Write an enzyme that holds these catalytic residues in place. Structure first.
Site, PDB file in Angstrom:
ATOM      1  N   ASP A  79       2.564 -16.053  -0.653  1.00  0.00           N
ATOM      2  CA  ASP A  79       3.091 -15.341   0.600  1.00  0.00           C
ATOM      3  C   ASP A  79       2.261 -16.025   1.993  1.00  0.00           C
ATOM      4  O   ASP A  79       3.019 -16.325   2.711  1.00  0.00           O
ATOM      5  CB  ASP A  79       2.233 -14.038   0.525  1.00  0.00           C
ATOM      6  CG  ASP A  79       2.826 -13.066   1.812  1.00  0.00           C
ATOM      7  OD1 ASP A  79       3.819 -12.919   1.950  1.00  0.00           O
ATOM      8  OD2 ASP A  79       1.673 -12.825   2.524  1.00  0.00           O
ATOM      9  N   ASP A  80       0.998 -16.601   1.647  1.00  0.00           N
ATOM     10  CA  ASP A  80       0.386 -17.440   2.740  1.00  0.00           C
ATOM     11  C   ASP A  80       1.002 -18.741   3.016  1.00  0.00           C
ATOM     12  O   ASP A  80       1.260 -19.256   4.065  1.00  0.00           O
ATOM     13  CB  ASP A  80      -1.015 -17.688   2.421  1.00  0.00           C
ATOM     14  CG  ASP A  80      -1.793 -16.417   2.278  1.00  0.00           C
ATOM     15  OD1 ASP A  80      -1.553 -15.485   2.664  1.00  0.00           O
ATOM     16  OD2 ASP A  80      -3.063 -16.547   1.587  1.00  0.00           O
ATOM     17  N   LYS A  92      13.472  -6.031  -2.086  1.00  0.00           N
ATOM     18  CA  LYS A  92      13.962  -6.602  -3.411  1.00  0.00           C
ATOM     19  C   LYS A  92      13.767  -5.546  -4.471  1.00  0.00           C
ATOM     20  O   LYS A  92      14.288  -5.596  -5.324  1.00  0.00           O
ATOM     21  CB  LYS A  92      13.273  -7.871  -3.844  1.00  0.00           C
ATOM     22  CG  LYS A  92      13.358  -9.105  -2.738  1.00  0.00           C
ATOM     23  CD  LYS A  92      12.430 -10.249  -2.834  1.00  0.00           C
ATOM     24  N   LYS A 151      -6.762  -6.735  -1.709  1.00  0.00           N
ATOM     25  CA  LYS A 151      -5.671  -6.463  -0.771  1.00  0.00           C
ATOM     26  C   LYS A 151      -4.266  -6.489  -1.516  1.00  0.00           C
ATOM     27  O   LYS A 151      -3.300  -5.790  -0.782  1.00  0.00           O
ATOM     28  CB  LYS A 151      -5.704  -7.492   0.494  1.00  0.00           C
ATOM     29  CG  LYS A 151      -4.876  -8.635   0.593  1.00  0.00           C
ATOM     30  CD  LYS A 151      -4.704  -9.266   1.876  1.00  0.00           C
ATOM     31  CE  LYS A 151      -4.132 -10.573   1.923  1.00  0.00           C
ATOM     32  NZ  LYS A 151      -3.808 -11.056   3.421  1.00  0.00           N
ATOM     33  N   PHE A 180       0.746 -14.620  -5.902  1.00  0.00           N
ATOM     34  CA  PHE A 180       1.894 -13.893  -5.401  1.00  0.00           C
ATOM     35  C   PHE A 180       1.373 -14.244  -3.752  1.00  0.00           C
ATOM     36  O   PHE A 180       2.010 -14.540  -2.856  1.00  0.00           O
ATOM     37  CB  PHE A 180       1.987 -12.569  -5.741  1.00  0.00           C
ATOM     38  CG  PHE A 180       3.267 -11.974  -4.938  1.00  0.00           C
ATOM     39  CD1 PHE A 180       4.797 -12.320  -5.464  1.00  0.00           C
ATOM     40  CD2 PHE A 180       3.042 -11.269  -3.738  1.00  0.00           C
ATOM     41  CE1 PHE A 180       5.629 -11.848  -4.787  1.00  0.00           C
ATOM     42  CE2 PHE A 180       4.184 -10.438  -3.159  1.00  0.00           C
ATOM     43  CZ  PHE A 180       5.410 -11.044  -3.351  1.00  0.00           C
ATOM     44  N   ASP A 230       0.050  -2.536   8.005  1.00  0.00           N
ATOM     45  CA  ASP A 230      -0.415  -3.946   8.024  1.00  0.00           C
ATOM     46  C   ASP A 230       0.575  -4.661   9.447  1.00  0.00           C
ATOM     47  O   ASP A 230      -0.184  -5.538   9.917  1.00  0.00           O
ATOM     48  CB  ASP A 230       0.030  -4.712   6.905  1.00  0.00           C
ATOM     49  CG  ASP A 230       0.057  -6.072   6.683  1.00  0.00           C
ATOM     50  OD1 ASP A 230      -1.115  -6.418   6.519  1.00  0.00           O
ATOM     51  OD2 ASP A 230       0.762  -6.931   6.979  1.00  0.00           O
ATOM     52  N   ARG A 286      10.428  -7.569   9.516  1.00  0.00           N
ATOM     53  CA  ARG A 286      10.205  -7.400   8.429  1.00  0.00           C
ATOM     54  C   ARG A 286      11.282  -7.011   7.689  1.00  0.00           C
ATOM     55  O   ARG A 286      12.173  -5.960   8.184  1.00  0.00           O
ATOM     56  CB  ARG A 286       9.133  -6.236   8.215  1.00  0.00           C
ATOM     57  CG  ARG A 286       8.899  -5.255   6.876  1.00  0.00           C
ATOM     58  CD  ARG A 286       8.134  -5.955   6.088  1.00  0.00           C
ATOM     59  NE  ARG A 286       6.595  -6.086   6.434  1.00  0.00           N
ATOM     60  CZ  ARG A 286       5.975  -7.057   5.829  1.00  0.00           C
ATOM     61  NH1 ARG A 286       6.054  -7.609   4.736  1.00  0.00           N
ATOM     62  NH2 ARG A 286       4.535  -6.990   6.318  1.00  0.00           N
ATOM     63  N   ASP A 303      -9.886  -8.746   4.850  1.00  0.00           N
ATOM     64  CA  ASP A 303      -8.771  -9.358   5.653  1.00  0.00           C
ATOM     65  C   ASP A 303      -9.019  -9.475   7.006  1.00  0.00           C
ATOM     66  O   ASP A 303      -9.184 -10.536   7.665  1.00  0.00           O
ATOM     67  CB  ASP A 303      -7.531  -8.903   5.161  1.00  0.00           C
ATOM     68  CG  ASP A 303      -6.321  -9.806   5.750  1.00  0.00           C
ATOM     69  OD1 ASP A 303      -5.991  -9.472   6.780  1.00  0.00           O
ATOM     70  OD2 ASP A 303      -5.931 -10.472   5.204  1.00  0.00           O
ATOM     71  N   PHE A 312       3.856   2.355   2.930  1.00  0.00           N
ATOM     72  CA  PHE A 312       3.042   2.727   3.458  1.00  0.00           C
ATOM     73  C   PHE A 312       2.068   1.616   4.134  1.00  0.00           C
ATOM     74  O   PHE A 312       1.648   1.525   5.397  1.00  0.00           O
ATOM     75  CB  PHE A 312       1.966   3.785   2.823  1.00  0.00           C
ATOM     76  CG  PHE A 312       0.731   4.164   3.052  1.00  0.00           C
ATOM     77  CD1 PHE A 312       0.094   4.428   4.243  1.00  0.00           C
ATOM     78  CD2 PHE A 312      -0.157   3.864   2.043  1.00  0.00           C
ATOM     79  CE1 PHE A 312      -1.159   4.647   4.452  1.00  0.00           C
ATOM     80  CE2 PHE A 312      -1.562   3.977   2.280  1.00  0.00           C
ATOM     81  CZ  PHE A 312      -2.043   4.291   3.584  1.00  0.00           C
ATOM     82  N   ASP A 317      -1.439  -6.591  12.350  1.00  0.00           N
ATOM     83  CA  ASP A 317      -1.243  -8.152  12.251  1.00  0.00           C
ATOM     84  C   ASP A 317      -0.426  -8.238  13.413  1.00  0.00           C
ATOM     85  O   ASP A 317       0.004  -9.660  13.579  1.00  0.00           O
ATOM     86  CB  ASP A 317      -0.559  -8.603  10.747  1.00  0.00           C
ATOM     87  CG  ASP A 317      -1.385  -8.177   9.791  1.00  0.00           C
ATOM     88  OD1 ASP A 317      -2.577  -8.180   9.780  1.00  0.00           O
ATOM     89  OD2 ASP A 317      -0.917  -8.565   8.634  1.00  0.00           O
TER      90      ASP A 317
HETATM   91  N1  LIG Z   1      -0.344  -8.034   1.643  1.00  0.00           N
HETATM   92  C1  LIG Z   1       0.082  -7.211   2.663  1.00  0.00           C
HETATM   93  C2  LIG Z   1       1.213  -7.902   3.597  1.00  0.00           C
HETATM   94  C3  LIG Z   1       1.435  -9.486   3.900  1.00  0.00           C
HETATM   95  O1  LIG Z   1       1.356 -10.002   2.627  1.00  0.00           O
HETATM   96  P1  LIG Z   1       2.454  -9.864   4.667  1.00  0.00           P
HETATM   97  O2  LIG Z   1       2.951 -11.350   4.687  1.00  0.00           O
HETATM   98  O3  LIG Z   1       2.651  -9.273   6.070  1.00  0.00           O
HETATM   99  O4  LIG Z   1       4.039  -9.400   4.118  1.00  0.00           O
HETATM  100  P2  LIG Z   1      -0.282 -10.018   4.583  1.00  0.00           P
HETATM  101  O5  LIG Z   1      -0.222 -11.456   4.732  1.00  0.00           O
HETATM  102  O6  LIG Z   1      -0.441  -9.111   6.045  1.00  0.00           O
HETATM  103  O7  LIG Z   1      -1.340  -9.813   3.581  1.00  0.00           O
HETATM  104 MG   LIG Z   2       0.795  -8.905   7.383  1.00  0.00          MG
HETATM  105 MG   LIG Z   3      -2.015  -8.515   6.734  1.00  0.00          MG
HETATM  106 MG   LIG Z   4       1.490 -12.545   4.682  1.00  0.00          MG
END
Ligand SMILES: NCCC(O)(P(=O)(O)O)P(=O)(O)O
Ligand SMILES: [Mg+2]
Ligand SMILES: [Mg+2]
Ligand SMILES: [Mg+2]
Ligand SMILES: NCCC(O)(P(=O)(O)O)P(=O)(O)O
Ligand SMILES: [Mg+2]
Ligand SMILES: [Mg+2]
Ligand SMILES: [Mg+2]
Lengths: 338, 338
Positions: B231-232, B45, B188, B227, B91, B100, B162, B86, B95
């Site tokens: 994301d979670d 984005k 993070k 944010f 990540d 992506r 994390d 990067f 993970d």
């Molecule tokens: N903040 C880095 C990437 C993440 O947000 P993403 O969900 O993998 O994009 P994460 O949950 O691993 O922290």
């Molecule tokens: Mg991740």
């Molecule tokens: Mg991660």
């Molecule tokens: Mg995430």
């Protein structure tokens, strides 16, 4: 003498760790940083880090070598050791290595694995933390920041060329030329292992001239090439109890100095044996490659190359050392030529 | 309007690539760098990168916004996008992610694998190359270098916390507390995703005051926490056709905002179900965790949290925006709150 120079440098590590691992809930990450630092920046010969200190003492007037100036010199020496640690933690993952500095590779440790990727980046971050903490008010601050950044970029470009010439599961004999080899080692090793510590001390001594740095580079990049050629020779023919690591170049299909020399001397029959056995995990195929190298007298070819290289580097010292003390380059030549 | 702001920023990417991919034998590494850049810094984005440009235009007097000054602003915006690239390339490896930005993760690409580790470091190196090429003669040069370095160190400390709270194959429910969660996301995500682009524009506008940066930080780190919480929430409840990525938090034993909320509301029976099914690869165990989250009305808990968070961030804008134009923070609030 050299072990006493080594001992003085190592004794500053405890302070480096304290300053880097000095906010409570985040304490667990700091405890992990301490473990990463202790496992990876300790166990080597510390030649690159010591080169900063030795060069600094030889380039700076003794009346200007006060307690704080010497502290900054062994801190930058340790930044060079951290840069090496960052690159080696990552290189061991990408080369699928087993051991390093007499112990299992950090990523092979149970409970570490690919988390070592972030651990490698933390080691890299520690360089810039130490430069800010100890050198921010010095006139050479930005020169050092830019020097470590440029050295990392050149190493990474070198690592890309190394990995592209060594694809897993693909025959790449046609790409194992002397020209490709020279470009890989120039970038992946020569810049950060040899130019960086001398340039760091040069900048700390106020020697920032383009011409002086170019002259030092002419000697040091040639020394860097020799060091990588010796590293490729030791990957196969070195004693792991001495080198502290197991060789993977043959299994990894690497553009090693040995395979380049093999291809220049191989008969059509020998080329076919190399083609069928190179870049594969099978122990008997690796053994077949080693037997072919021994049949082509590559250990003798290396000893003749080391003699010819030493004379060439010493001729480069006679041409380009001035106005720096020749001892700056001779000390380093003694430590790398065996 | 917003898509036209987006289009202007994206149109500068071709020049960024040309300047970075401008020595022949090393050309193969440069061709790989171009492929890394095109695959990873394009498809998002570009909100963080655009934030630099939008903030710059709002913080700098229009008569001072000459062609070269604007060029430096979208170059720094692209440095922010490179920093994100990067961190995300690395990540995704750590993970064990699949997709992506609507495509397979760079490391999952056949022929890439763990070579993506060096590719991630190259993206990081490109930031400092661009800063040197476009901003070396500017008074904010060192402020920008130090800001990107410090933002990377904080992110890496956050990534360590994390990964330490999410050990593979280990039950870590006791460590999934609100306090641990707040510290993980602060480091993070919050620092590099929200403080960095606004601080970069602030330094380019000559706003270098400790107090002004501290006030901007008070709003932006709180926005960063929201944010990451969103994301979670989206990791499990988001549409992958919209988010462009598949969730892995449950399988990866992550200290997600969802599991923290689950543990605060769970009966002893529900805690046992979570303990037996969390942090494991089995699809039916992941499904069992999702059913428990839905039983505890966590989607409704998230919607109430988003409302409460938006009001709090807007109250922080009223307190700490001055003397900056509130539009700097309101523009960013509009883009992240849905
Ligand atoms: N903040 C880095 C990437 C993440 O947000 P993403 O969900 O993998 O994009 P994460 O949950 O691993 O922290
Ligand atoms: Mg991740
Ligand atoms: Mg991660
Ligand atoms: Mg995430
Ligand atoms: N130069 C980095 C590390 C090596 O020297 P090492 O032999 O792994 O220590 P490589 O042969 O992978 O290039
Ligand atoms: Mg290696
Ligand atoms: Mg290697
Ligand atoms: Mg080697």
């Amino acid at each position: 003498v050299y072990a006493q120079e080594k001992q003085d440098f190592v004794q500053h590590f405890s302070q480096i760790v304290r300053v880097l691992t000095e906010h409570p809930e985040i304490g667990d990450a700091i405890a992990r940083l301490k473990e990463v630092l202790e496992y990876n920046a300790i166990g080597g010969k510390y030649n690159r880090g010591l080169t900063v200190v030795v060069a600094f003492r030889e380039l700076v007037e003794p009346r200007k070598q006060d307690a704080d100036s010497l502290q900054r010199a062994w801190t930058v020496g340790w930044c060079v050791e951290l840069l090496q640690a960052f690159f080696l933690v990552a290189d061991d993952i990408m080369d699928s290595s087993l051991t390093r500095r007499g112990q299992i590779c950090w990523y092979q440790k149970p409970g570490v694995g690919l988390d070592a990727i972030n651990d490698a980046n933390l080691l890299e971050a520690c360089i810039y933390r130490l430069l800010k903490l100890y050198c921010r008010e010095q006139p050479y601050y930005l020169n050092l920041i830019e020097l470590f950044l440029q050295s990392s970029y050149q190493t990474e470009i070198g690592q890309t060329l190394d990995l592209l010439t060594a694809p897993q599961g693909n025959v790449d004999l046609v790409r194992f030329t002397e020209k490709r080899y020279k470009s890989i080692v120039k970038y992946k090793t020569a810049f950060a292992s040899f130019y960086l510590p001398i340039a760091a001390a040069m900048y700390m001594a106020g020697i920032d001239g383009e011409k002086e740095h170019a002259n030092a580079k002419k000697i040091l990049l040639e020394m860097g090439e020799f060091f990588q050629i010796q590293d490729d020779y030791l990957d196969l023919f070195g004693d792991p109890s001495v080198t502290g690591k197991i060789g993977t170049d043959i299994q990894d299909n690497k553009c090693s100095w040995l395979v380049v020399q093999c291809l220049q001397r191989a008969t059509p029959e020998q080329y076919q044996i190399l083609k069928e056995n190179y870049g594969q995990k099978e122990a008997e195929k690796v053994a077949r490659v080693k037997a072919l190298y021994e049949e082509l007298d590559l250990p003798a070819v290396f000893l003749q190359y080391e003699e010819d290289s030493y004379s060439h580097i010493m001729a480069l010292i006679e041409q380009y050392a001035a106005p720096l003390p020749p001892a700056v380059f001779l000390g380093l030549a003694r430590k790398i030529y065996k």
